[PDB]
Design a protein around this ligand. Structure first.
Ligand SMILES: *[C@@H]1O[C@H](CO)[C@@H](O)[C@H](O)[C@H]1NC(C)=O
Ligand SMILES: CCC(=O)Nc1nc(C)cs1
Ligand SMILES: CCC(=O)Nc1nc(C)cs1
Length: 340
């Protein structure tokens, strides 16, 4: 079990002004995994009000429980988590509705606070006094909106630790199910994100901002565009036929739809050709890393926990221990190990 700590700086808040926080389980014999929860987002007063009625735990800490159980990559049992398992474990709840990009407080002009980028910085800050100062690796991981959040924030964490005087901590990223395409729909994300950035005062990585310039920062929310601007090592996990991608594409089988689905998989595979650390199975699904049975899926005979271990070794190719694992077969569940 991981134990809740609300942020000591109570000006760093969830949407409704309640304090943000993190859940922690220390492992004193180990030198850190910080995981970003996902859960869509909201981009105007009306749709944020709706989310506050029926998804309030994603906008407030008032009802959070005192503990949570670590699962998947957050599990401390080697049977469930062959990778790491002995690491210090941190789960950061998503309560900012801003894909972890916001830097704006609640005020007389703002009904809600959007502080995702500042929540991450404050968590890292308060952890340094609880043992993070002695770390050798900090892995910033996340699923869905949290996976996009890794891409937007990993280099800022590295810069923060350098400026605070901790140059020996190696910061790395693991982005799960947050690598989306701004593609043609079958019957939109780009417009919703463009409006969100204005509403949230959203921030993107500096090198990506300088490429796309004012008004075009929405481009940096799309993995294949922001990834080449990043300096920290990042491992990318993405289903080739992601259910959230298909949902925004208005897909819920005749020739037209067959060709659309096959072209989606081919496009995703193309965007990963130059990503040396990646795991991309040919399955229709969504998310992976915090599921208890995350060890079952294999690409070309290699599981995700093994691929991550091989990545660790590469950061010290390796005989029989690969890190670039992308299916080439063209239809959902052509890989027999896909989740049932
Ligand atoms: C609390 O966080 C805010 C936002 O980052 C910052 O401006 C302020 O200085 C912090 N306060 C303290 C006491 O650290
Ligand atoms: C919130 C996760 C999701 O389904 N969609 C996202 N789209 C972008 C562009 C970031 S997160
Ligand atoms: C990167 C060189 C290499 O093979 N690394 C190794 N790591 C272990 C754990 C044994 S050898």
């Amino acid at each position: 079990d991981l134990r809740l700590h609300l942020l000591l700086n109570t000006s760093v808040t969830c949407n409704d002004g309640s304090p943000a926080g993190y859940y922690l389980k220390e492992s004193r014999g180990s030198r850190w995994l910080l995981f970003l929860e996902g859960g869509w987002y909201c981009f105007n007063r009306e749709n944020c009000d709706s989310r506050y009625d029926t998804m309030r735990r994603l906008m407030s800490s008032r009802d959070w429980p005192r503990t949570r159980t670590g699962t998947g990559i957050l599990s401390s049992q080697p049977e469930e988590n062959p990778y790491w398992w002995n690491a210090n474990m941190v789960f950061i709840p998503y309560c900012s509705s801003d894909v972890w990009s916001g830097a704006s407080s609640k005020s007389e002009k703002n009904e809600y606070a959007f502080m995702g980028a500042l929540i991450i910085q404050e968590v890292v800050r308060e952890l340094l006094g609880r043992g993070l100062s002695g770390a050798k690796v900090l892995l910033l991981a996340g699923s869905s909106a949290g996976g996009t959040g890794v891409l937007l924030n990993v280099d800022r964490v590295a810069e923060q630790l350098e400026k605070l005087g901790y140059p020996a901590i190696q910061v790395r990223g693991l982005a799960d199910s947050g690598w989306f395409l701004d593609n043609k729909q079958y019957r939109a994300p780009t417009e919703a994100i463009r409006r969100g950035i204005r509403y949230w005062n959203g921030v993107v990585p500096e090198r990506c901002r300088r490429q796309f310039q004012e008004g075009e920062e929405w481009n940096c929310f799309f993995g294949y565009k922001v990834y080449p601007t990043l300096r920290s090592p990042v491992f990318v996990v993405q289903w080739l036929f992601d259910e959230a991608q298909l949902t925004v594409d208005n897909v819920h089988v005749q020739e037209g739809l067959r060709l659309y689905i096959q072209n989606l998989g081919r496009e995703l595979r193309h965007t990963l050709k130059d990503v040396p650390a990646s795991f991309a199975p040919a399955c229709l699904s969504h998310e992976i890393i915090i599921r208890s049975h995350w060890t079952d899926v294999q690409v070309k005979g290699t599981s995700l926990p093994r691929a991550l271990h091989c990545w660790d070794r590469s950061l010290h190719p390796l005989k029989g221990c690969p890190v670039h694992l992308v299916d080439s077969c063209p239809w959902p569940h052509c890989n027999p190990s896909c989740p049932t």
